[PDB]
Design a protein around this ligand. Structure first.
Ligand SMILES: Nc1ncnc2c1ncn2[C@@H]1O[C@H](COP(=O)(O)OP(=O)(O)OP(O)(O)=S)[C@@H](O)[C@H]1O
Ligand SMILES: Nc1ncnc2c1ncn2[C@@H]1O[C@H](COP(=O)(O)OP(=O)(O)OP(O)(O)=S)[C@@H](O)[C@H]1O
Ligand SMILES: Nc1ncnc2c1ncn2[C@@H]1O[C@H](COP(=O)(O)OP(=O)(O)OP(O)(O)=S)[C@@H](O)[C@H]1O
Ligand SMILES: [Mg+2]
Ligand SMILES: [Mg+2]
Ligand SMILES: [Mg+2]
Lengths: 728, 479
C-alpha cells in the first residue's frame, strides 16, 4: 500500500547529502546512479539530494545522512516520503549565511577554505533553508542558505556564484544543533549500539502503540565497561537520536548534596521524567550513588540506595520512562539493582578492537586536516590498550604537536586567528607518531575480545589438525542441520598437547580467525596472578565475558604453569589441581551446549595435567601437535619468511633437512638470527637489503635444538597414552 | 516493601511498620507481606546504623506481639535467606519456610504456556522444545524471553505492515503471530540468571540409556526403591535400610548414569554435587554451603544426593598418603558430619562415585555413611552391544552395521570409549554430508574408519588394579 513510504536509518557514506537505497528500490522508482532526488519529510519541509546505488544493504531501507535528517526534522527509524525529479536545475545567485554558534573565533573569508573545495567537482543540490555542514580548519561549521532563486532549482555548478558576508544568522530552536553527539559520533560499538536501538527505539518512538499492545518494555538498561569507552557518549547519542526527553543524573553530583537533598533530587528527576512524555533517565556513574549496601558506612547512602530501588520499582509501563545507567565498576553495584524490574538489560561497552579504534580515529580526525602520509590504519594497529578516550586524547595531542610547529614558524600571535592559515596547518604522520610515543593506554590490563589476525597461512604444516579443528568448530556453527539430523551433540572442548613451540597458540588463534569468531586468551600465569588476590569471581567473569561474545573460543594457554603450581598430579604429594582449575571445571560443566562458546586448552606438560580436564564433556578432543617433519619445516620457514626480503639463492628445503629435531619456535629463532646478522651487516656497511644464503648458514651454525630426544620419546608416549591418564 | 521502608527517614519507617501492623490487626483476617525482607532486617551483628538495628528490633517486637486473636498472617520474601537476622527465623516470628526453587523442565514449560496464552503462536512453535532448551531460566527469565520473542515478531510486522497508526486495531493484531524462529532468536539473546544455582529435579535418563549393568540395576532397585515403596517389609524384618552407596571402577563405565537412572526410576529428586564444585565453593571458606546442600536435599525428600568425581576431592592433597598429610580435609569431614547427622527415616539417599578407589579416605566407607560398595567394571562383550545400541538410538544407523562385530573388536573399551567411537563415526558421516553437499545414514564404512583410530582409555595395569580393589576395598580402613 502506497509504495512511496521509505524507512530511514543511519547512512554509510561519510559525506554530505547522498542517500543510499536497496536493490528493489532504484528499479521500483526507476532512478539511475547519479540522479537528483527530492525528499519529503514531516512538518511540510523538503530536501533535495543525490541517490547512491547500493544493493547489499537490506531488503527495504533507505540510508539518510545526519546532515539532512535535521533538514527534514526526521529521526532514526522514521518513515520518509520521496519523489524523483530527474531535471537538471542550475542556480544563479545563492544568498548563503553562517550560524553564530559554530563560527565564533574564526575570521576572514571562510569560503575560500570551506566552500571552495566542497562545491567543485561534486554537483550536489541545494534547497531553501538547508543546513549543510562543511568540515575544515580542525573544526566543523554547519551553514545556511537563506535566499536564492525559487526552491530548489539549484545544484552545484561552476556558474553558481558566491559572496562573502561575515554576518552569521542566529540559530532558532526549531532545528537541532548538528554539533551534538549522534550515532555517527560513536565508533567501535555497532553491535552494542544495535542492541541499544532494538531495546530503546520502539518503546520511545511508538509509545502509544507499545502501550496498547501490552508487552513489557526493557526499562533497566545498564551500560558498563572500562572508563572512557563511550558510555556517556552512547547514552547522550541515544537521547539525541530519539525525540525523548533526556534527564541526566550524575552520581558524584547527587552524592555531593546534603543529606535529604539528594533524595529530593532523585524524586524530582523521576517525577519530571514521568511528567515529560516518553523520556530517558540516565544515571551516569551509578556506582557513586549505589554501592553494595553491605559495604557502605553512612545511613544516608543506604537511604539513597533504597530510594533508588523504590523509584525503580515504582516505575510503571504507563510512564513510558526508560532508565539507563553507566558504571565502570559493575561488580561494585548493589546486587538488588541488577535484578528483574530494576536493571535487567546489561550492555557491555568493551574495549574497541583494531577496526573499531580505526573508526574512532576517523571520527576524531574528520575535522582535522591530515597530511598524505597519515596512515590512520597504522595508528590503529599500533594502539592496543587504547580506548575511545585514549584515542581522542592521542588525536588532540597530535593536533597540538602540529600547532606547536606552526605557532613558532608562523607567528600566530594574533588574538583571533583566521581560517586562511588554519588550513595551512596540517597534522603529519610524524605528529601522530610523537603523540603515540607519549600516551598511556588505560585498558592495557583489560582482557581482549576480538577476532585474531593470524590466518592459516601463518602456520606451516599441521594440515590434519587444521581439518580436525575445522570439523570441531566451523561445522557445528555453520551446519547445525547435519548435527541435529544425525543427533550428535558437538564436543565443546579441545586440548592441545605436545612439545613446546609447535604452534599450539597459533592453531587456536587461527581457528578463531577462520570462523570469524571472538577469541579470548587466558594464560596460566594470568590465572595464577588473578587468583592470588583470592578473587573467585574473575575466573567466573572470564566465562561470562566469553558468553556474551558467542560465537567465541575461550583459549587457556600455558596450562603447564597452572599444573606446576604444586608440581603436578603428585608434585609435593598434594594435588596441583586446585585454585582456579576446579572453578574452571565447574564453569565448563555449567555452560550450555547450545551456546557457541568453544574451549581450547594448550599444554606442553601432558604428564602433570590433571585428569579431570580430560573427562568427556569438558575437554575430550585430545589433539597432539608433534614436531614438524621435513615438509612442515619448509612450510614453517616459508611462513616465517613472508615479511622478510629473502634472497633467491636461499634453499629452504636444505635448511629443513638440516634441522631435524627443531620446533616451529626453533625455526623462527633461526630466521630471526639470520635476519639479525643481515641487520648487523647493513649497520656495518652503512659506516645489501637482502637476507642471504650466508646469513642462514651462519645462523644454522649456532642453531640449537629446544626439544631433547628423550623429550621427543616421552611426548610420543603421551601422544599414544593420554586418554588413559585418568583412573590411576 | 523493604527498600521503600528503608528509604524513609529515621523514626518514620518505624511509624510505617507500626501502622502496617495496626491496620492489619484492625482489618479482619489479613496478610502482611514484607517483600525483600533482607532490606530491612539484615544480621544485627553485620550492620552499621543504629536506625537499622531499631528497625530490626521493632520488626521483632511486632512479630512477637502478634497474637492468635489478631488472625494476621505475616509472609515475607527474600532471595538471600542466609542474610536474614537469625532472630526472625525462630519460633513465633518466622517458623514456616518455603523454598520457591528454580522451575524444572515441566514447570518452565508451564510458565511458558502461562506467559504465551495471550500471545498468538504459529503452528511450528514448540513450547516444550523451548522449555527443554532453557536451563538456568527462572519465571522472570521466561517472561522476558516470551516478551522478547513477541517484540521480535512485532519488529518484523511493524516494517512489513505500516503500523504507524496511533491506536492500532485488533484486526491486524491477530495477523501478527509469533513464529518458532522468533522464540529461537529470543533464546539466542537471553542471559539465564540461575545458571550457578543447584538443580533439584527428576533426571531424564532412564535405564534404557544404560547398556548392561543389569546386576547393579537390580541392586540399586533393592537399595532405593524397596525402602521407599515397601516400608512394611523392612519394619517386619526389622532391618534399617542402608542410606549410602559408593560407586567405584574404571572411568567412563556409567557411574553418573547409574545414579541418575536410579533417581529417575524412583521418580525422586536428584542433586548432583561434583568434586570440583565442592573444592571451588570451599575456597571461599564457606562451611555453610555444604550444609545447605544437605539441607536442600532434606526438603527434596525423597531425594538422591549424588557426589560425583570424588577423585577430585581425594586428590586435593594427593590421597590417603599424598604429600604425607591427609587429603581427607575441608569438605569431606563436613560431608561425613552431615551424613552422620541425617535421620534414617528421611528418604534422602546418598550416592558417591569415584574412579580412584586407592585414595578414597576410609571414613567414607564406615557402616552408616557409605557401606554399600558397588563396583562397576568395564562392559563385557554383550554389555558393549547394549551400550552401542543405547548410544545409537538417536542416530540413523544403516542396517549393514554389525554392532556385535564392533563389540568383539573392542575389548578394553569403556562406555565412554564406545560413545567416542559412535561420535567419531557420526562426525565422519557429517563430513561426508558436508562434502557431498558441495547419504543421511551413518554406514558400516564410517564405523570401520572410526574403529581404525579408536583408542583404549583404561590400561591393562589399570584393569588389574581395579580388579584388585574390586575384591579388597572393604578392608581399606584400618591400615
Ligand atoms: N567509542 C567511542 N567513539 C568515539 N568517541 C569515543 C568513544 N569512546 C570514547 N570516546 C571519546 O572519549 C570521550 C570519553 O568520554 P566517555 O567515554 O563518554 O566517558 P565514559 O565512557 O562514561 O567513561 P567514564 O565516565 O570515565 S567511566 C568521549 O566524550 C568521546 O569524545
Ligand atoms: N607451525 C608453525 N608455523 C609457523 N610458526 C610457528 C609454528 N609453530 C611455531 N611457530 C613459531 O613459534 C612461535 C610460538 O608458537 P606457539 O603457537 O606459541 O607454540 P606453542 O605450542 O604455544 O609453544 P610456546 O610455549 O608458545 S613457544 C610462534 O609465534 C611462531 O613464531
Ligand atoms: N553403560 C553405559 N551405557 C551407555 N553409555 C555409557 C555407559 N557408560 C558410559 N557411557 C557413556 O559415557 C559417558 C560417561 O558416563 P558416566 O556415567 O559419566 O561414567 P563415569 O563412571 O562417571 O565416568 P566419567 O568420569 O563420567 S567419563 C556417558 O554420558 C555415556 O555417553
Ligand atoms: Mg562518563
Ligand atoms: Mg604459545
Ligand atoms: Mg560421570
Amino acid at each position: 500500500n502506497r509504495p512511496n513510504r521509505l524507512i530511514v536509518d543511519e547512512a554509510i557514506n561519510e559525506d554530505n547529502s547522498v542517500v543510499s537505497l536497496s536493490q528493489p528500490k532504484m528499479d521500483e522508482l526507476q532512478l539511475f546512479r547519479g540522479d537528483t532526488v527530492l525528499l519529503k519529510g514531516k512538518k511540510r519541509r523538503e530536501a533535495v539530494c543525490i541517490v547512491l546505488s547500493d544493493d547489499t544493504c537490506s531488503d527495504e531501507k533507505i540510508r539518510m545522512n545526519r546532515v539532512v535528517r535535521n533538514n527534514l526534522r526526521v529521526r532514526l527509524g522514521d518513515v520518509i516520503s520521496i519523489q524523483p525529479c530527474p531535471d537538471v536545475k542550475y542556480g544563479k545567485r545563492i544568498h548563503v549565511l553562517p550560524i553564530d554558534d559554530t563560527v565564533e573565533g574564526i575570521t576572514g573569508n571562510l569560503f575560500e577554505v570551506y566552500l571552495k573545495p566542497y562545491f567543485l567537482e561534486a554537483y550536489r543540490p541545494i534547497r531553501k533553508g538547508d543546513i549543510f555542514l562543511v568540515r575544515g580548519g580542525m573544526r566543523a561549521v554547519e551553514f545556511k542558505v537563506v535566499e536564492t532563486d525559487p526552491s530548489p532549482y539549484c545544484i552545484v555548478a561552476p556558474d553558481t556564484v558566491i559572496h562573502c558576508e561575515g554576518e552569521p544568522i542566529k540559530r532558532e530552536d526549531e532545528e537541532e544543533s548538528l554539533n551534538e553527539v549522534g550515532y555517527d559520533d560513536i565508533g567501535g560499538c555497532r553491535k552494542q549500539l544495535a542492541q541499544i536501538k532494538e531495546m530503546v527505539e520502539l518503546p520511545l518512538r511508538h509509545p502509544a502503540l507499545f502501550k496498547a499492545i501490552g508487552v513489557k518494555p526493557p526499562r533497566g538498561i545498564l551500560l558498563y565497561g572500562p572508563p572512557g569507552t563511550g558510555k556517556t557518549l552512547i547514552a547522550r547519542a541515544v537521547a539525541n537520536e530519539t525525540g525523548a526527553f533526556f534527564f541526566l543524573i550524575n552520581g558524584p553530583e547527587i552524592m555531593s548534596k546534603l543529606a535529604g537533598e539528594s533524595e529530593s533530587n532523585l524524586r524530582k528527576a523521576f517525577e519530571e521524567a514521568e511528567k515529560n512524555a516518553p523520556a530517558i533517565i540516565f544515571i551516569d556513574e551509578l556506582d557513586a550513588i549505589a554501592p553494595k549496601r553491605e559495604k557502605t558506612h553512612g545511613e544516608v547512602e543506604r537511604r539513597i540506595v533504597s530510594q533508588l530501588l523504590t523509584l525503580m520499582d515504582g516505575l510503571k509501563q504507563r510512564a513510558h520512562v526508560i532508565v539507563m545507567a553507566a558504571t565502570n565498576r559493575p561488580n561494585s553495584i548493589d546486587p538488588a539493582l541488577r535484578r528483574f524490574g530494576r536493571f535487567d538489560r546489561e550492555v557491555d561497552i568493551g574495549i574497541p578492537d583494531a577496526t573499531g579504534r580505526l573508526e574512532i580515529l576517523q571520527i576524531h580526525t574528520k575535522n582535522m586536516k591530515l597530511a598524505d602520509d597519515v596512515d590512520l590504519e597504522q595508528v590503529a594497529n599500533e594502539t592496543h590498550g587504547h580506548v575511545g578516550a585514549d584515542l581522542a586524547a592521542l588525536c588532540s595531542e597530535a593536533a597540538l604537536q602540529a600547532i606547536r610547529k606552526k605557532m613558532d614558524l608562523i607567528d600566530l600571535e594574533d588574538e583571533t586567528i583566521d581560517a586562511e592559515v588554519m588550513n595551512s596547518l596540517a597534522v603529519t604522520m610524524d605528529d601522530f607518531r610523537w603523540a603515540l610515543s607519549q600516551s598511556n593506554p588505560s585498558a592495557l590490563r583489560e582482557t581482549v575480545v576480538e577476532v585474531p589476525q593470524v590466518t592459516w597461512e601463518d602456520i606451516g604444516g599441521l594440515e590434519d589438525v587444521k581439518r580436525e579443528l575445522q570439523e570441531l568448530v566451523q561445522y557445528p556453527v555453520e551446519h547445525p542441520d547435519k548435527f541435529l539430523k544425525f543427533g550428535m551433540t558437538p564436543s565443546k572442548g579441545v586440548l592441545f598437547y605436545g612439545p613446546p613451540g609447535c604452534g599450539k597458540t597459533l592453531l587456536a588463534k587461527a581457528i578463531a580467525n577462520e570462523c570469524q569468531a571472538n577469541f579470548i586468551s587466558i594464560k596460566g600465569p594470568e590465572l595464577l596472578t588473578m587468583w592470588f588476590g583470592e578473587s573467585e569471581a574473575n575466573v567466573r567473569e572470564i566465562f561470562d565475558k566469553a558468553r556474551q561474545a558467542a560465537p567465541c573460543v575461550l583459549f587457556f594457554d600455558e596450562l603447564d604453569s597452572i599444573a606446576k603450581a604444586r608440581g603436578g598430579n603428585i608434585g609435593n604429594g598434594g594435588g596441583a589441581a586446585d585454585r582456579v582449575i576446579n572453578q574452571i571445571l565447574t564453569e565448563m560443566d555449567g555452560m550450555s551446549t547450545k551456546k557457541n562458546v568453544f574451549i581450547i586448552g594448550a599444554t606442553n606438560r601432558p604428564d602433570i595435567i590433571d585428569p579431570a580436564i580430560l573427562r568427556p564433556g569438558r575437554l575430550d578432543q585430545l589433539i597432539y601437535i608433534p614436531l614438524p617433519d621435513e615438509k612442515s619445516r619448509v612450510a614453517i620457514l616459508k611462513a616465517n619468511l613472508r615479511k622478510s626480503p629473502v634472497a633467491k639463492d636461499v634453499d629452504l628445503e636444505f635448511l629443513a633437512k638440516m634441522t631435524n629435531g627443531f620446533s616451529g619456535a626453533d625455526l623462527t629463532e633461526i630466521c630471526q638470527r639470520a635476519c639479525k646478522l643481515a641487520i648487523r651487516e647493513s649497520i656495518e656497511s652503512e659506516i645489501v637489503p637482502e637476507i642471504r644464503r650466508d646469513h642462514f648458514e651462519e645462523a644454522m651454525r649456532f642453531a640449537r635444538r629446544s626439544v631433547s630426544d628423550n623429550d621427543i620419546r616421552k611426548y610420543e608416549m603421551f601422544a599414544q597414552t593420554l586418554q588413559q591418564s585418568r583412573g590411576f
